[PDB]
C-alpha cells in the first residue's frame, strides 16, 4: 500500500529493451487507449517494477514469462509520476519478460503529451488533429514507459484511426489493416534504438510533399492542406542538409524516411523526433510573396538544427538532463557549420558571435548556472533548455573548434559519433574522444563545470603585454579558465594565439605596436579591457579607419565597452563617446550591436518618470544613424543581411517618429486600407508600415480585421507585432485576453505578444499585471521551468529599475511557494533589477549630462 520507491530517478535494475505501442485515438471525443508491451530484464532479483505514468487511467497490468501470464498490482506516486507493479513472485535475474499494461487518457489540452491542435479552413470550419510532443519528460502522458533518455529501446507502434484520417510516426508505414467498421489499425515499422522522448505520432488530414536524398532517404513536408503550397523551400533546405550532414560526418541517416511537419499549435520552434520533425508553421513555411528574409533564414537554421539533433540527440544522446547540452549546444553549433557551406549566400557565420554576447547577459549573473549542473524534478530539467545549454554549449564549442583546428575538431566528433552511435553519453566521454586525436578535458571542464566567463585585462608596456583573468559578474568567486586568447595588432593581422591558464601573464611583441586587440572576430567566450589609453587608442581607430579591424571586431568593441561599464571599468561617457563612431558605420553586425546596447537604455527610461532625457536619448540614437536610415530604399532589394538592416532600421525610425520615415509609412499604411489589403507592399517595409497604422483606432481595428485570413506566418507575425504597439490601454488589454484565450490569436503566440505589450511604453504595467492575475492558468498551459515561462517572466519585469518594482517582483513570485517561488528565471529577473537600479542611479545623471553637451 505504501509507495514502495521514493526515488525521482528510476531503478536502474530493470531495463526496457522493445516496446509495442497500440495507440486508439478519438478525435472527436478527445480520449484516447492504449495497450503497452514492454520486454524488460532485471540485473538483481526483484518484485517491483516502477516505471513512469502522468494522468494515465490504468485498467490492467499483467506480467508474461511456456508463456506463462500472472496479473500485477498497480500502485501509484503521483507527484512522482511513477506506478509500481507488484508482481507475486520475485523476477529471475537475466531472464526475458514482458510487462503488459492496458490504459486510457484524455489528449491533453496543453502543448505537451498527445495533445489537441487545431486549425479553421478557408470557410471558417474547425478542425482537429493530434500531435506528440514529448521531450524532456512526457512520453509517460502517452504511455506508461522507463521515461529517462538512458533506457534506450526499439519502438513497434501501431495507431487505430478512422479512414478520413492519416497517421504518421517515426517509422514508415509497413501495413494498414482494417480491424473494425471505421476502424483502420496501422502498422509501422520497429525503430532502431532510441529513447522514450523521441517517439512520435500525429493523427491528421495533413496533405505532403515528397523529394529523394542522393542517398535514398525519402524527405516529405507535411502541412495543413491550405498551406502545402509553402513547404517547397523547407522541402529543398532539407534535402540539402540531410546530404550535408551524411557526407560531412561519413555516417549515414539510418532510417528510410524523415518527414517534416508542421503543427497548427506547438510550444517552442520545433523537435527532433527520429524520421518525424515537428515545427511550427512559422518555422517551416515559406510564402514567396510575404515572408520576410529573418523568417527565411530562421526556416533554413531550424531545419538545419532539427537534422543536426539526428546525430547529436537521436543517434548519440546524453546520459541525464544534466548534460542537456551534449544534445542543444552541438544542434545550436551545427546550424552555423551547416548551413555556411549549404546556404553561402545567408552568410550566417557572421551572425555567430550575437548568441554568445545573449548567453553572457544571462551568464555576467550570480543566478546564472554551469553548462553542466545536476536537474532532478521535471520543472529543473525543463529549465536546462536555457541560453546557457544553447548559446553558450555552441560558444565554447566554437572557442575549442578555433582552438584545436577544424580538421583536428572534425576527426573527435566523428570519432565520438561512431563509439557512441545508439548509446548516452557524459560531459567526460566528449573531452575523451577530443583528446583521443592536448589537455582537452581540463581546459574543457573550466568552460562546462563552472559558470560565467571571465574578463581578460590587457596592460601594455612598451613591447611587453600582460594578460591577467578574473570573473566578470556584475556586483569573491576565484574562478580560473584555460582562456584560448586571440590577438591582432596594428602591425600584423594574423591571428596570434596565446593559452592563458593562469591568474596572470605576459608575452613579448617582435616590435612596438599602435594599437592591439585581442578576441579575434569574438569567438573566445570572454570580454576584454584594455588599462591605460588602450580604449582611447581604439576608440581613435574606430573614429578614424575603422575598416582597419573586421566589422565583428567592431561589435565586439562595441558590446565590451559597455558591459565594461556595468562593473566600473570604464565611464559610461567614454562608452558612449565610442558609439558615436556608429555615424560612419554601415554594416549590419555592427550597427544591430550598437541598437542592441543603446536600445535597452531607453527601455529602463520608458518605465520611469524620464520623459525629457528619454526623448532626447531617442532624438540621439535617430541622428546617430540618421545617413544610414535615409540611405534605405522602401524594396525588399539586396542581400538577406541587407534586407533584414533596412527593415529593423525603417522600423526604428518609425516608432521613434523620425518624419521622413512616419510619413511614408503613413502613405503605404492608407493605400494598403484603401486596397482593402490587397496591396502588395514590400516586405521589408510592412513592420514599420503596420506598426504606424496600427496607432489609430480606425487603422488597429482593420490590421485585426484582416489577421483572420492570413495564411502567411510572416503577415501574422508583423500585424501582432504592429498590434502590440498602439498606445490604447483597453486595445492592449483585449489582445492578452484574446491571445490567452486562443481564438482569435492562438495561445502559441500568448508568450510573444505578452513580451511585446512588456516592451510598450504604455502596457508594461498591464503586462505585469496580466502574468500576475494569471500565473495558475499559464503555468498549466505552458509549464513551470519552460522556456516559454521563463519569457513571460523576464519581458515583463527586467527592464524595471526602481526599489518598488523590485519589491512588486520579489512578494509576488516568493508568495507562490512551489507553483513558481524557485524558478531559476524569477531569481535572474531579479538579479537584473537589481543591477537595473545601481546601474540608473550611477548613470542616469551622467547620461543627462552627455546628451546635453552631445550639442
Ligand atoms: C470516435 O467516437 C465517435 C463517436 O462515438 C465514433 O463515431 C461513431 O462511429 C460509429 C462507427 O462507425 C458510427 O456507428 C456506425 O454508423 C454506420 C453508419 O454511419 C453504421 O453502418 C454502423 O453499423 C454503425 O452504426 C456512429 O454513427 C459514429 N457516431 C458519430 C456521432 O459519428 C468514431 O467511430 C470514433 N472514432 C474512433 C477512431 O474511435
Ligand atoms: C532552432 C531550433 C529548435 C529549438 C527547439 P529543439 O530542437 O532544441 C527541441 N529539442 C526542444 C524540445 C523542448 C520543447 C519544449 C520545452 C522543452 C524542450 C527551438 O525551438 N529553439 C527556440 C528556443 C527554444 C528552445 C527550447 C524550448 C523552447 C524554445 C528558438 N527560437 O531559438
Ligand atoms: C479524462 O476526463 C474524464 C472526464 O471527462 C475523467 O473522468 C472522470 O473521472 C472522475 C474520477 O474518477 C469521475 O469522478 C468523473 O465522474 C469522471 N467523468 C466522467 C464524465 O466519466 C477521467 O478520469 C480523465 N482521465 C484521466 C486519465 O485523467
Ligand atoms: C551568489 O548567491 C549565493 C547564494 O545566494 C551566495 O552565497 C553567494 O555569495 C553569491 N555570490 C555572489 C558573488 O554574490
Ligand atoms: C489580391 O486579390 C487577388 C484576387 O483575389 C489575389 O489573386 C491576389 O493574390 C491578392 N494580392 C494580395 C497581395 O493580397
Ligand atoms: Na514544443
Ligand atoms: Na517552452
Ligand atoms: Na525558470
Ligand atoms: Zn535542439
Redesign the pocket.
Known sequence: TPFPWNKIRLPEYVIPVHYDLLIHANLTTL?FWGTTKVEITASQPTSTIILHSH???ISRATLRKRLSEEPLQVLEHPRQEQIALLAPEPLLVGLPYTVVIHY???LSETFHGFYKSTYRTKEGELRILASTQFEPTAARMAFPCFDEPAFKASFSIKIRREPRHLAISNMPLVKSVTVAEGLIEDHFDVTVKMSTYLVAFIISDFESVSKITKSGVKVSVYAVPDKINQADYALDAAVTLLEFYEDYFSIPYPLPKQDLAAIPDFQSGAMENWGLTTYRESALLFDAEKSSASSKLGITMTVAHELAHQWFGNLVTMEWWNDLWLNEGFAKFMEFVSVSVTHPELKVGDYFFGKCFDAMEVDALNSSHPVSTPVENPAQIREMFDDVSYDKGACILNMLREYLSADAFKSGIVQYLQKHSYKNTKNEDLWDSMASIVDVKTMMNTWTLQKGFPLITITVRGRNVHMKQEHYMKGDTGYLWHVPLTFITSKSDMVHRFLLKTKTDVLILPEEVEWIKFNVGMNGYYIVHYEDDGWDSLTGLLKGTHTAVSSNDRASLINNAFQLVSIGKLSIEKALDLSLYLKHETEIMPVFQGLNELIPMYKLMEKRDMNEVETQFKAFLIRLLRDLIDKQTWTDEGSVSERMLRSQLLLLACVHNYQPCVQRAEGYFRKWKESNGNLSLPVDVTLAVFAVGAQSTEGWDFLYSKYQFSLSSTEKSQIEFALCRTQNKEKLQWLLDESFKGDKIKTQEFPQILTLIGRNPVGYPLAWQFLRKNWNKLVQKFELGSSSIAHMVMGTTNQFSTRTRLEEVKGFFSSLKENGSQLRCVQQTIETIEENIGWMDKNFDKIRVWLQSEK
Open positions: 480520449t494522468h494515465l487511467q486510457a487518457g484524455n
